[PDB]
């Protein structure tokens, strides 16, 4: 096997496509051989565990990964840490209590500050709704995923500080476009006076926009996404989405690879009771 392996969520989402490119570019800068893989879809928890196990069973020196769920890679990651594989968690926080209970750790975790992402999206909505405020909803990612949970907490905490805002719904749409359209339809049905919906990612935000359109409410219901994927940036320019909190997956990926290579130079994996190296990549609100 090459020196390093990378496990991304799914290349069917531009966020992960850009993270692969960032890693590829960084690999050339560092001089390292990297094999980059991804599961076929967001719901492939089991096959991602198998993918991780297959790479962990090869002799890569390090494996950088973004788990599809907080817990689906706890067991294989613990196993890999025990084998002395230098592990870096990209983007989506593996459940660290669960991992410590399974006897492993990760050298580092590189991600966006996801609480700030949800606070930016909510703060923008609050601003746009102005003095009168109104009812708002959050369309979360997969419940329990650290990335979505942080965005949810950041947005919820911001909305709770603004009394003119009424959070009427907070539901998971599992990073899925179809599911988000369905969840937004139901939310719009139950609370037809809703004025804005923060979505924990662009894949979901796009489907939420279609629900809003079906309801004859485009522009009357703000829709804010997260990631800054190409189609969502286009929708934001065209008024189909109000805004998106853009991330820089290329730098998450490059920075994670660099942390992994750096860790390998130490010659031992991180101790179980040492906090992983932590690095945050900025986000930025993208509006019309
Ligand atoms: O794969 C779904 C999503 O996972 C999150 O952890 C990433 O930060 C991006 O929001 C991505 O779109
Ligand atoms: Zn080899």
Strand content: 15-25%
Number of domains: 2
What order do the SSEs take from the amino end to the carboxyl end, as H and E?
Answer: EHEHEHEHEHEHEHEHEHEHEE
Rg of Cα set: 19 Å
Shape assignment: elongated
Number of strands: 12
Distance between the termini: 46 Å
Organism: Escherichia coli (strain K12)
Pfam family, one: Peripla_BP_4
GO molecular function: monosaccharide binding
Subcellular location: Periplasm
Describe the structure.
There is one protein chain. This protein is of the alpha/beta class. The chain contains ten helices and twelve strands. It has a six-stranded parallel beta sheet with strand order 2-1-3-4-5-11, with helices on both faces. It has two domains: 1-110 and 250-278, 3-Layer(aba) Sandwich (Rossmann fold); 111-249 and 279-288, Rossmann fold (3-Layer(aba) Sandwich). Bound molecules: beta-D-allopyranose (ALL) and zinc ion. Residues 9, 13, 15, 91-92, 147, 175, 201, 203, 226-227, 247 line the site of beta-D-allopyranose (ALL). Pfam families: Peripla_BP_4 (PF13407).
Task: Summarize the topology.
Blueprint: E1 4-10, H1 14-30, E2 34-39, H2 45-57, E3 62-65, H3 74-82, E4 86-90, H4 96-101, E5 108-112, H5 114-129, E6 134-140, H6 146-161, E7 165-172, H7 177-190, E8 196-199, H8 202-214, E9 222-227, H9 230-238, E10 243-246, H10 249-264, E11 277-281, E12 284-287
Parallel strand pairs: 1-2, 1-3, 3-4, 4-5, 5-11, 6-7, 6-8, 8-9, 9-10
Antiparallel strand pairs: 10-12
Helix pairs in contact: 1-10, 2-3, 5-6, 7-8
The structure holds beta-D-allopyranose and zinc ion.
